[PDB]
């Protein structure tokens, strides 16, 4: 919509002759910005975004033993979690009763839905994330976009014949060998509530298709390899410290695996 000036703001000019990261590709072919650790001033960005009056849903699914994660994710997407924007929490879970009490931030809801235009008045950006994970660090607004996906924290240095992809040229997820930009993991990604609900609605056709068809992250892959993402998320936001350390790379280790 239309957009007020910003505030006079005191920060570190930018410096067109160096580059931002040496060691990582910080810009998509497609001019798609990958999000790391330096790349962003989340001064700027906060304030782009409050000027907005921005609300971030975010969505977790938490079915059988599942539901024991809450606690954990809920308290620490507290601590770290667009914390000063105003966030809606999803939990669909097939125990109401089972979800935890956990204490919110001013400005922040939570949803218990037992197992569409609803989202779409409620909230302007939705986030879609497993919930046996806890957030350790900052995850802001610097996200938001009309559509992300986040590189697979497995994959994010091997060529795309490694990765794996659907390569059963009778599945509607199918990738030949030749093709692919990176290997996105379904664990974190998001957009506008627009272009999220068209990603699940294209999902959830070509997956009843292959049933049809009697073959069974794969659609994730196939969807954004096809409709680019408009910003890529580095593994920091979706990353298993038990099997993959700290590496010097990562900066930040933000929304991690519960070991
Ligand atoms: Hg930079
Ligand atoms: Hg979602
Ligand atoms: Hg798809
Ligand atoms: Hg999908």
Redesign the pocket.
Known sequence: EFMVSLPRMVYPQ?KVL????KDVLVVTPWLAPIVWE??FNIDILNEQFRLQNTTIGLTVFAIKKYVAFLKLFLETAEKHFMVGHRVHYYVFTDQPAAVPRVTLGTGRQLSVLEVERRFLSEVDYLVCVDVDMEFRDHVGVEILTPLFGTLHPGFYGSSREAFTYERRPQSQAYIPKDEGDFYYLGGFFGGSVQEVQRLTRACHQAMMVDQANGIEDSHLNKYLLRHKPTKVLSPEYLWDQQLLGWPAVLRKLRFTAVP
Do not use: E, I, N, Q
Request: proline share 29%; glycine share 14%.
């Open positions: 930018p160096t580059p931002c990261r330096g790349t």
